[PDB]
Design an enzyme around this catalytic site. Structure first.
Site, PDB file in Angstrom:
ATOM      1  N   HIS A  55       0.821  -1.211   0.000  1.00 14.11           N
ATOM      2  CA  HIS A  55       0.000   0.000   0.000  1.00 14.11           C
ATOM      3  C   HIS A  55       0.871   1.284   0.000  1.00 14.11           C
ATOM      4  N   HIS A  61     -14.487 -36.664  21.918  1.00 19.39           N
ATOM      5  CA  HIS A  61     -15.786 -36.701  21.265  1.00 19.39           C
ATOM      6  C   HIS A  61     -15.711 -37.835  20.231  1.00 19.39           C
ATOM      7  N   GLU A  97     -23.433 -34.582  18.172  1.00 16.93           N
ATOM      8  CA  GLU A  97     -24.198 -35.677  18.755  1.00 16.93           C
ATOM      9  C   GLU A  97     -25.679 -35.381  18.603  1.00 16.93           C
ATOM     10  N   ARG A 145     -27.214 -37.860  16.231  1.00 13.08           N
ATOM     11  CA  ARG A 145     -27.700 -39.163  16.665  1.00 13.08           C
ATOM     12  C   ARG A 145     -28.918 -38.991  17.567  1.00 13.08           C
ATOM     13  N   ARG A 187     -19.902 -40.956  25.941  1.00  8.20           N
ATOM     14  CA  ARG A 187     -18.850 -40.643  24.952  1.00  8.20           C
ATOM     15  C   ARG A 187     -17.687 -41.605  24.926  1.00  8.20           C
ATOM     16  N   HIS A 225     -11.715 -33.547  22.938  1.00  7.75           N
ATOM     17  CA  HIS A 225     -12.680 -32.478  22.919  1.00  7.75           C
ATOM     18  C   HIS A 225     -12.840 -31.573  24.141  1.00  7.75           C
ATOM     19  N   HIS A 226     -12.749 -32.074  25.359  1.00  8.33           N
ATOM     20  CA  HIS A 226     -13.104 -31.265  26.513  1.00  8.33           C
ATOM     21  C   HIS A 226     -12.239 -31.727  27.651  1.00  8.33           C
ATOM     22  N   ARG A 247     -18.302 -35.776  31.114  1.00  3.96           N
ATOM     23  CA  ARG A 247     -19.346 -34.748  31.000  1.00  3.96           C
ATOM     24  C   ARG A 247     -20.426 -35.217  30.042  1.00  3.96           C
ATOM     25  N   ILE A 304     -22.263 -25.869  27.930  1.00  6.24           N
ATOM     26  CA  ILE A 304     -22.803 -24.523  27.724  1.00  6.24           C
ATOM     27  C   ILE A 304     -23.673 -24.208  28.943  1.00  6.24           C
TER      28      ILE A 304
HETATM   29  C1  LIG Z   1     -16.723 -28.025  18.625  1.00  7.69           C
HETATM   30  C2  LIG Z   1     -17.530 -28.027  19.869  1.00  7.69           C
HETATM   31  C3  LIG Z   1     -18.929 -28.292  19.998  1.00  7.69           C
HETATM   32  C4  LIG Z   1     -19.460 -28.262  21.373  1.00  7.69           C
HETATM   33  N1  LIG Z   1     -20.802 -28.422  21.491  1.00  7.69           N
HETATM   34  C5  LIG Z   1     -21.264 -28.168  22.683  1.00  7.69           C
HETATM   35  C6  LIG Z   1     -22.773 -28.161  22.753  1.00  7.69           C
HETATM   36  O1  LIG Z   1     -23.474 -28.291  21.810  1.00  7.69           O
HETATM   37  N2  LIG Z   1     -23.179 -28.146  24.100  1.00  7.69           N
HETATM   38  C7  LIG Z   1     -22.296 -28.090  25.161  1.00  7.69           C
HETATM   39  O2  LIG Z   1     -22.769 -28.091  26.275  1.00  7.69           O
HETATM   40  N3  LIG Z   1     -20.931 -27.956  25.083  1.00  7.69           N
HETATM   41  C8  LIG Z   1     -20.503 -28.081  23.888  1.00  7.69           C
HETATM   42  N4  LIG Z   1     -19.161 -28.044  23.809  1.00  7.69           N
HETATM   43  C9  LIG Z   1     -18.121 -27.626  24.788  1.00  7.69           C
HETATM   44  C10 LIG Z   1     -17.860 -26.172  24.787  1.00  7.69           C
HETATM   45  O3  LIG Z   1     -18.626 -25.303  23.935  1.00  7.69           O
HETATM   46  C11 LIG Z   1     -17.274 -25.592  26.095  1.00  7.69           C
HETATM   47  O4  LIG Z   1     -16.679 -26.603  26.935  1.00  7.69           O
HETATM   48  C12 LIG Z   1     -16.511 -24.298  26.261  1.00  7.69           C
HETATM   49  O5  LIG Z   1     -16.851 -23.378  25.186  1.00  7.69           O
HETATM   50  C13 LIG Z   1     -16.413 -23.776  27.665  1.00  7.69           C
HETATM   51  O6  LIG Z   1     -16.574 -22.394  27.407  1.00  7.69           O
HETATM   52  P1  LIG Z   1     -15.662 -21.337  28.271  1.00  7.69           P
HETATM   53  O7  LIG Z   1     -16.152 -19.960  28.264  1.00  7.69           O
HETATM   54  O8  LIG Z   1     -15.484 -21.953  29.589  1.00  7.69           O
HETATM   55  O9  LIG Z   1     -14.357 -21.389  27.366  1.00  7.69           O
HETATM   56  P2  LIG Z   1     -14.119 -20.899  25.841  1.00  7.69           P
HETATM   57  O10 LIG Z   1     -15.386 -20.704  25.143  1.00  7.69           O
HETATM   58  O11 LIG Z   1     -13.113 -21.900  25.344  1.00  7.69           O
HETATM   59  O12 LIG Z   1     -13.470 -19.467  26.036  1.00  7.69           O
HETATM   60  C14 LIG Z   1     -12.150 -19.379  26.598  1.00  7.69           C
HETATM   61  C15 LIG Z   1     -11.471 -18.147  26.021  1.00  7.69           C
HETATM   62  O13 LIG Z   1     -10.425 -17.655  26.843  1.00  7.69           O
HETATM   63  C16 LIG Z   1      -9.386 -17.165  26.024  1.00  7.69           C
HETATM   64  N5  LIG Z   1      -8.148 -17.291  26.816  1.00  7.69           N
HETATM   65  C17 LIG Z   1      -7.539 -18.451  27.211  1.00  7.69           C
HETATM   66  N6  LIG Z   1      -6.472 -18.262  27.903  1.00  7.69           N
HETATM   67  C18 LIG Z   1      -6.334 -16.852  28.002  1.00  7.69           C
HETATM   68  C19 LIG Z   1      -5.515 -15.948  28.654  1.00  7.69           C
HETATM   69  N7  LIG Z   1      -4.423 -16.268  29.426  1.00  7.69           N
HETATM   70  N8  LIG Z   1      -5.773 -14.645  28.405  1.00  7.69           N
HETATM   71  C20 LIG Z   1      -6.727 -14.084  27.682  1.00  7.69           C
HETATM   72  N9  LIG Z   1      -7.584 -14.993  27.033  1.00  7.69           N
HETATM   73  C21 LIG Z   1      -7.314 -16.290  27.258  1.00  7.69           C
HETATM   74  C22 LIG Z   1      -9.374 -18.318  24.953  1.00  7.69           C
HETATM   75  O14 LIG Z   1      -8.647 -17.895  23.792  1.00  7.69           O
HETATM   76  C23 LIG Z   1     -10.863 -18.345  24.652  1.00  7.69           C
HETATM   77  O15 LIG Z   1     -11.483 -17.409  23.812  1.00  7.69           O
HETATM   78  C24 LIG Z   1     -18.718 -28.011  22.510  1.00  7.69           C
HETATM   79  C25 LIG Z   1     -17.348 -27.744  22.443  1.00  7.69           C
HETATM   80  C26 LIG Z   1     -16.911 -27.671  21.097  1.00  7.69           C
HETATM   81  C27 LIG Z   1     -15.459 -27.307  21.072  1.00  7.69           C
HETATM   82  C1  HEM Z   2      -4.469  -2.900   7.283  1.00  8.45           C
HETATM   83  C2  HEM Z   2      -5.399  -2.252   6.534  1.00  8.45           C
HETATM   84  C3  HEM Z   2      -5.823  -2.777   5.167  1.00  8.45           C
HETATM   85  C4  HEM Z   2      -5.988  -4.043   4.758  1.00  8.45           C
HETATM   86  C5  HEM Z   2      -5.982  -5.356   5.550  1.00  8.45           C
HETATM   87  C6  HEM Z   2      -6.170  -4.036   3.322  1.00  8.45           C
HETATM   88  C7  HEM Z   2      -6.351  -5.145   2.527  1.00  8.45           C
HETATM   89  C8  HEM Z   2      -5.826  -5.130   1.254  1.00  8.45           C
HETATM   90  C9  HEM Z   2      -5.279  -6.270   0.541  1.00  8.45           C
HETATM   91  C10 HEM Z   2      -5.286  -7.700   1.142  1.00  8.45           C
HETATM   92  C11 HEM Z   2      -4.908  -5.862  -0.671  1.00  8.45           C
HETATM   93  C12 HEM Z   2      -4.284  -6.682  -1.848  1.00  8.45           C
HETATM   94  C13 HEM Z   2      -2.783  -6.378  -2.049  1.00  8.45           C
HETATM   95  C14 HEM Z   2      -2.089  -7.286  -3.051  1.00  8.45           C
HETATM   96  O1  HEM Z   2      -2.877  -7.637  -3.951  1.00  8.45           O
HETATM   97  O2  HEM Z   2      -0.863  -7.581  -2.962  1.00  8.45           O
HETATM   98  C15 HEM Z   2      -5.169  -4.451  -0.754  1.00  8.45           C
HETATM   99  C16 HEM Z   2      -4.922  -3.634  -1.845  1.00  8.45           C
HETATM  100  C17 HEM Z   2      -5.383  -2.340  -1.948  1.00  8.45           C
HETATM  101  N1  HEM Z   2      -5.813  -1.569  -0.912  1.00  8.45           N
HETATM  102 FE1  HEM Z   2      -5.905  -2.112   1.024  1.00  8.45          FE
HETATM  103  N2  HEM Z   2      -6.113  -2.724   2.911  1.00  8.45           N
HETATM  104  C18 HEM Z   2      -5.922  -1.931   4.009  1.00  8.45           C
HETATM  105  C19 HEM Z   2      -5.897  -0.543   3.961  1.00  8.45           C
HETATM  106  C20 HEM Z   2      -6.143   0.244   2.844  1.00  8.45           C
HETATM  107  C21 HEM Z   2      -6.334   1.674   2.792  1.00  8.45           C
HETATM  108  C22 HEM Z   2      -6.314   2.569   4.058  1.00  8.45           C
HETATM  109  C23 HEM Z   2      -6.517   1.995   1.516  1.00  8.45           C
HETATM  110  C24 HEM Z   2      -6.660   3.390   0.850  1.00  8.45           C
HETATM  111  C25 HEM Z   2      -6.137   4.440   1.520  1.00  8.45           C
HETATM  112  C26 HEM Z   2      -6.482   0.798   0.718  1.00  8.45           C
HETATM  113  C27 HEM Z   2      -6.653   0.698  -0.644  1.00  8.45           C
HETATM  114  C28 HEM Z   2      -6.214  -0.354  -1.415  1.00  8.45           C
HETATM  115  C29 HEM Z   2      -6.025  -0.364  -2.834  1.00  8.45           C
HETATM  116  C30 HEM Z   2      -6.342   0.824  -3.781  1.00  8.45           C
HETATM  117  C31 HEM Z   2      -5.520  -1.552  -3.156  1.00  8.45           C
HETATM  118  C32 HEM Z   2      -5.185  -2.091  -4.576  1.00  8.45           C
HETATM  119  C33 HEM Z   2      -6.402  -2.644  -5.343  1.00  8.45           C
HETATM  120  C34 HEM Z   2      -7.751  -2.065  -5.037  1.00  8.45           C
HETATM  121  O3  HEM Z   2      -8.371  -2.429  -3.990  1.00  8.45           O
HETATM  122  O4  HEM Z   2      -8.279  -1.210  -5.807  1.00  8.45           O
HETATM  123  N3  HEM Z   2      -6.243  -0.263   1.563  1.00  8.45           N
HETATM  124  N4  HEM Z   2      -5.710  -4.019   0.447  1.00  8.45           N
HETATM  125  O1  LIG Z   3     -22.918 -31.013  19.893  1.00  5.57           O
HETATM  126  C1  LIG Z   3     -22.119 -31.931  20.371  1.00  5.57           C
HETATM  127  O2  LIG Z   3     -21.830 -33.016  19.802  1.00  5.57           O
HETATM  128  C2  LIG Z   3     -21.496 -31.692  21.670  1.00  5.57           C
HETATM  129  C3  LIG Z   3     -22.002 -31.293  22.801  1.00  5.57           C
HETATM  130  C4  LIG Z   3     -21.135 -31.265  23.970  1.00  5.57           C
HETATM  131  O3  LIG Z   3     -19.851 -31.466  23.881  1.00  5.57           O
HETATM  132  O4  LIG Z   3     -21.760 -30.975  24.981  1.00  5.57           O
HETATM  133 NA    NA Z   4     -12.453 -28.474  33.080  1.00  8.72          NA
END
Ligand SMILES: Cc1cc2nc3c(=O)[nH]c(=O)nc-3n(C[C@@H](O)[C@@H](O)[C@@H](O)COP(=O)(O)OP(=O)(O)OC[C@H]3O[C@@H](n4cnc5c(N)ncnc54)[C@H](O)[C@@H]3O)c2cc1C
Ligand code: HEM
Ligand SMILES: O=C(O)/C=C/C(=O)O
Ligand code: NA
Ligand code: HEM
Ligand code: HEM
Ligand code: HEM
EC number: 1.3.2.4
Length: 568
Positions: free
Chosen positions: A8, A365, A378, A381, A402, A504-505, A544, A550
Site C-alpha cells: 500500500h 468426542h 451428537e 444421533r 462418549r 474435545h473437553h 461430562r 454450555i
Molecule cells: C466443537 C464443539 C462443539 C461443542 N458443542 C457443545 C454443545 O453443543 N453443548 C455443550 O454443552 N458444550 C458443547 N461443547 C463444549 C464447549 O462449547 C465448552 O466446553 C466451552 O466453550 C467452555 O466455554 P468457556 O467460556 O469456559 O471457554 P471458551 O469458550 O473456550 O473461552 C475461553 C477463552 O479464553 C481465552 N483465553 C484463554 N487463555 C487466556 C488468557 N491467558 N488470556 C486471555 N484470554 C485467554 C481463549 O482464547 C478463549 O477465547 C462443545 C465444544 C466444542 C469445542
Molecule cells: C491494514 C489495513 C488494510 C488491509 C488489511 C487491506 C487489505 C488489502 C489487501 C489484502 C490488498 C491486496 C494487495 C495485493 O494484492 O498484494 C489491498 C490492496 C489495496 N488496498 Fe488495502 N487494505 C488496508 C488498507 C487500505 C487503505 C487505508 C486503503 C486506501 C487508503 C487501501 C486501498 C487499497 C487499494 C487501492 C488496493 C489495490 C487494489 C484495489 O483495492 O483497488 N487499503 N488491500
Molecule cells: O454437539 C455436540 O456433539 C457436543 C455437545 C457437547 O460437547 O456438549
Molecule cells: Na475443566
C-alpha cells in the site's frame, strides 16, 4: 512487495492507515481496522468480491465483528485464521502457513525486564473486575458483574471472540424449563442432577452439580431475557429426557449464544480488549488480588489494578502434549478445539495459588468428521441417526456415553464408522445442512448406492436400516438397547458421514467452591480470585454429558460475575 504495508505505501502515505501521531490505537487495532474498512468496505462488502461456491474467507458464522487484522497483518506476512481447522483453497496475499506457536506462561518468565518495568509503572487502568477470556463464561461474568454495579475490563488473547463456545452445536442442558413444557417435555432439576452424577461416574462434586442443575432453568431464562432463542429441545446421550436447548429448528447453540452475549456486552459499553493475554494474577501483602499483569500483542505488557480477577479461559484440549501426559491413550488424536485452547489460563490459576483437580479426565468426542476434521454434533444421533460399520451393521447404542461410543467406533473395521440418516433427520436439525455444505455428508436415493459410494456393504446396510425402522416402530431396541428412537430412517434420500473420535473437553481444572471462588490445595479461598467454565474442575466428574458445558458456562460465569462484584 514483501508485505501488505509496503504494497500500500507505493501509492499511499503512512497515515492512510495510522493515527496522526502514528501510535497504535490499542491492542484491538480499532482505528487501524476502521481505516481498512473505510477503503475496502465492511467484512460483508468484501465477501461479495471473494465468493467460492462452498466457502468464503470473508463470510463465516463467527460471532462479533471479526477484525481485518485477524488475518491481514500490515508489516509482516500472516496466516489465515480458517486454516487452524479447515484446508480451503485460499490465496491470501502475503499469506504464510498456519502455525500456532504461543509461548507458555512459563517461557514468558524470560521477559523479566519488561515485566518489572510494567509492574513499576502506574496501573494502565483501575477497575473493579477484570474478566479473562471471551468465551461463554467470560461474557456472562462481564455482563453480570456490570449489571451488579462493578466496572469491568474483559480480555481475549485471540484476535476473535468466542473461544470454543462459538463452536457449540448440540445444545445447552436445562431442566424444568418453560421451553421443555411447551415441547411437552417433563423433567426436573433432580433428574438432570441424577443424570449428571451417574454420567460423571459419581466422581463429580455434588455441591457443584447441584448448582448446575438448580440454576439451569434460570441460566436459560437469563439468556432468553437477553435475546437468545433456546426453544428447540433435543436429546443427547446420557440424558433421560430431551433437555438440550438450542434455536428454533435445531440450529447450533454456540455462535447464537456468543452473538447474544456480545450484543449485550456492547449495549452496556463493556470494555473488551482483543489480542490481550492475561499472564499473572497480582496479589497484595495479605495474599488477596490487587490486579493482573497483561500482555498486549501490539502495545506490550501493562497491568490493570482491580479487586477481582475472573479466569474464564476454557480448556486445554487443543494441547495434545499435556493431554498425552495425563492420558497416554489420546496421544496423536486430532481435536475439535479452537487453536488457543491450550491450558495457559490454568498455569495463571496455579501460579496464583489455585489448585487443580480431576486433570486426568479428558473426553474424546466420538464423532469427528474424518473428511472435515470438525465435530459432527451428537444432536445428529439424538435426532435419530444410526452408526454403521464398514460391514453395514449397527455396533453400539448411538446415544450411549462418549467413552463407550468412542471405544466402539475405534474397534470397527478401519477405526471409523459412519453416521447414517434420511431427510426426516436432516429437516429436523438445521445444523446438518452445515455438514452437507462442508462436503462431509454424501447422499444417494438408496442405501445400496450410498454404500457403494462409501465402501459400505450395500445389501447389509439396506437390511440394517430396515431392521432399525422395525425396531423404531416396535419401540424397543433389543439389539443395542438405545433408549430413545425418535424417527424411522425412511424419508427422501439417505446420507452417510464418516466419523472417528477427537480430543474435545477437559473435565479437570481449577478447584472452585459454589460461589466460583478459586481455592488452594488446603481448600482455602484465595480472596478476589474466581474461576468459571471449562477452566474449572469438579463440575463434570469423570465424564461430562453432551450439553452440560454450555449450561456450566452461563451458570458459573454469571454467578462468578455477581460474586466478584459484591466482593468488589
Ligand atoms: C466443537 C464443539 C462443539 C461443542 N458443542 C457443545 C454443545 O453443543 N453443548 C455443550 O454443552 N458444550 C458443547 N461443547 C463444549 C464447549 O462449547 C465448552 O466446553 C466451552 O466453550 C467452555 O466455554 P468457556 O467460556 O469456559 O471457554 P471458551 O469458550 O473456550 O473461552 C475461553 C477463552 O479464553 C481465552 N483465553 C484463554 N487463555 C487466556 C488468557 N491467558 N488470556 C486471555 N484470554 C485467554 C481463549 O482464547 C478463549 O477465547 C462443545 C465444544 C466444542 C469445542
Ligand atoms: C491494514 C489495513 C488494510 C488491509 C488489511 C487491506 C487489505 C488489502 C489487501 C489484502 C490488498 C491486496 C494487495 C495485493 O494484492 O498484494 C489491498 C490492496 C489495496 N488496498 Fe488495502 N487494505 C488496508 C488498507 C487500505 C487503505 C487505508 C486503503 C486506501 C487508503 C487501501 C486501498 C487499497 C487499494 C487501492 C488496493 C489495490 C487494489 C484495489 O483495492 O483497488 N487499503 N488491500
Ligand atoms: O454437539 C455436540 O456433539 C457436543 C455437545 C457437547 O460437547 O456438549
Ligand atoms: Na475443566
Ligand atoms: C511507511 C509507512 C508506515 C510507517 C512508518 C508505519 C509504522 C508502523 C509502526 C512503527 C508500527 C509498529 C508499532 C508498535 O509496535 O508499537 C506499525 C504497525 C502497524 N501498521 Fe504501519 N506504518 C506505515 C504504513 C502502514 C500502512 C500503509 C498500513 C496498512 C496498510 C499500516 C498498518 C499497520 C498495522 C495494522 C500495524 C500493527 C502491526 C502490523 O500489522 O504489522 N502501516 N506501523
Ligand atoms: C474488512 C476486513 C477485511 C478486508 C477489508 C480484507 C481485504 C481483503 C482484500 C481486498 C483481499 C483481496 C481481494 C481481491 O483480490 O479481490 C483479501 C483477500 C483475502 N483475505 Fe481479507 N480482508 C478482511 C478480512 C479478512 C479476514 C477476517 C480473513 C480471514 C478470516 C481474511 C482472509 C483473506 C483471504 C484468505 C484472502 C484470499 C481470498 C481467496 O483466496 O478466496 N480477510 N482480503
Ligand atoms: C473465517 C474463518 C472460517 C471460515 C470461512 C469457515 C468456513 C466454514 C464453512 C463454509 C463451513 C461449512 C458450513 C457452511 O456451509 O457454512 C464450516 C464448518 C465448520 N467449521 Fe468453519 N470456517 C472458519 C473457521 C473455523 C475455525 C477456526 C474452526 C474451529 C476452531 C471452524 C470449525 C467449523 C465447524 C465445527 C464446522 C461444522 C459445522 C458447524 O459446526 O456449524 N471453522 N466452516
Amino acid at each position: 512487495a514483501d508485505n501488505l504495508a509496503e504494497f500500500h505505501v507505493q501509492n499511499q502515505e503512512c497515515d492512510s492507515c495510522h493515527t496522526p501521531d502514528g501510535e497504535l490505537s490499542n491492542d484491538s487495532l480499532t482505528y487501524e481496522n476502521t481505516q481498512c474498512v473505510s477503503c475496502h468496505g465492511t467484512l460483508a462488502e468484501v465477501a461479495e468480491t471473494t465468493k467460492h461456491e462452498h466457502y468464503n474467507a470473508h463470510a463465516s458464522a463467527f460471532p462479533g465483528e471479526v477484525a481485518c487484522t485477524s488475518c491481514h497483518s500490515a508489516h509482516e506476512k500472516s496466516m489465515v485464521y480458517c486454516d487452524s481447522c479447515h484446508s480451503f483453497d485460499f490465496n491470501m496475499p502475503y499469506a504464510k502457513k498456519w502455525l500456532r506457536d504461543e509461548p507458555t506462561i512459563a517461557e514468558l518468565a524470560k521477559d523479566k525486564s519488561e515485566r518489572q518495568a510494567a509492574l513499576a509503572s502506574a496501573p494502565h487502568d483501575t477497575v473493579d473486575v477484570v474478566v479473562v477470556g471471551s468465551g461463554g463464561a467470560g461474557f456472562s461474568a462481564a455482563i453480570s458483574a456490570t449489571d451488579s454495579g462493578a466496572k469491568v475490563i474483559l480480555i481475549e488473547k485471540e484476535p476473535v471472540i468466542g473461544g470454543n463456545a462459538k463452536l457449540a452445536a448440540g445444545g445447552m442442558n436445562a431442566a424444568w424449563t418453560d421451553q421443555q413444557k411447551a415441547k411437552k417435555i417433563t423433567d426436573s432439576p433432580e433428574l438432570m442432577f441424577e443424570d449428571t452424577m451417574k454420567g460423571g461416574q459419581n466422581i463429580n462434586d455434588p455441591a457443584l452439580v447441584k448448582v448446575l442443575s438448580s440454576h439451569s432453568k434460570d441460566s436459560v431464562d437469563w439468556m432468553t431475557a437477553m435475546g437468545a432463542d433456546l426453544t428447540d429441545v433435543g436429546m443427547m446421550g446420557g440424558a433421560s429426557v430431551n433437555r438440550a436447548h438450542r434455536p428454533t429448528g435445531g440450529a447450533g447453540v454456540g455462535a447464537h449464544v456468543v452473538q447474544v452475549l456480545y450484543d449485550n456486552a456492547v449495549k452496556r459499553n463493556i470494555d473488551l480488549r482483543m489480542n490481550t493475554r492475561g499472564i499473572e494474577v497480582l496479589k497484595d501483602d495479605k495474599g488477596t488480588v490487587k490486579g493482573i499483569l497483561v500482555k498486549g500483542m501490539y502495545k506490550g505488557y501493562y497491568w490493570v489494578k482491580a479487586d477481582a480477577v475472573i479466569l474464564a479461559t476454557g480448556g486445554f484440549a487443543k494441547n495434545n502434549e499435556r493431554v498425552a501426559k495425563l492420558d497416554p491413550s489420546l496421544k496423536g488424536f486430532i481435536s475439535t478445539n479452537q487453536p488457543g485452547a491450550v491450558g495457559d489460563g490454568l498455569d495463571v490459576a496455579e501460579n496464583a495459588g489455585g489448585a487443580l483437580k480431576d486433570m486426568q479426565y479428558i473426553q474424546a468426542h466420538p464423532t469427528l468428521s474424518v473428511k472435515g476434521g470438525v465435530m459432527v454434533t451428537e444432536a445428529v444421533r439424538g435426532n435419530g441417526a444410526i452408526l454403521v460399520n464398514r460391514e453395514g451393521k449397527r455396533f453400539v447404542n448411538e446415544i450411549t456415553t462418549r467413552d463407550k461410543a468412542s471405544a466402539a467406533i475405534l474397534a470397527q473395521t478401519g477405526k471409523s464408522a459412519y453416521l447414517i440418516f434420511d431427510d426426516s433427520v436432516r429437516k429436523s436439525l438445521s445444523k446438518i445442512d452445515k455438514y452437507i455444505g462442508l462436503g462431509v455428508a454424501p447422499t444417494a436415493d438408496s442405501l445400496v448406492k450410498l454404500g457403494k459410494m462409501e465402501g459400505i456393504d450395500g445389501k447389509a446396510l439396506t437390511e440394517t436400516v430396515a431392521r432399525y425402522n422395525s425396531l423404531v416402530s416396535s419401540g424397543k431396541d433389543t439389539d443395542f438397547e438405545r433408549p430413545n428412537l425418535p424417527r424411522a430412517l425412511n424419508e427422501g434420500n439417505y446420507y452417510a458421514i464418516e466419523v472417528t473420535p477427537g480430543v474435545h473437553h477437559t473435565m479437570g481444572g481449577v478447584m472452585i467452591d459454589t460461589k466460583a471462588e478459586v481455592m488452594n490445595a488446603k481448600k482455602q479461598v484465595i480472596p478476589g480470585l474466581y474461576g468459571a467454565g471449562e477452566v474449572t474442575g469438579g463440575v463434570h466428574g469423570a465424564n461430562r454429558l453432551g450439553g452440560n458445558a454450555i449450561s456450566d458456562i452461563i451458570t458459573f460465569g454469571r454467578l462468578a460475575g455477581e460474586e466478584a462484584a459484591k466482593y468488589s
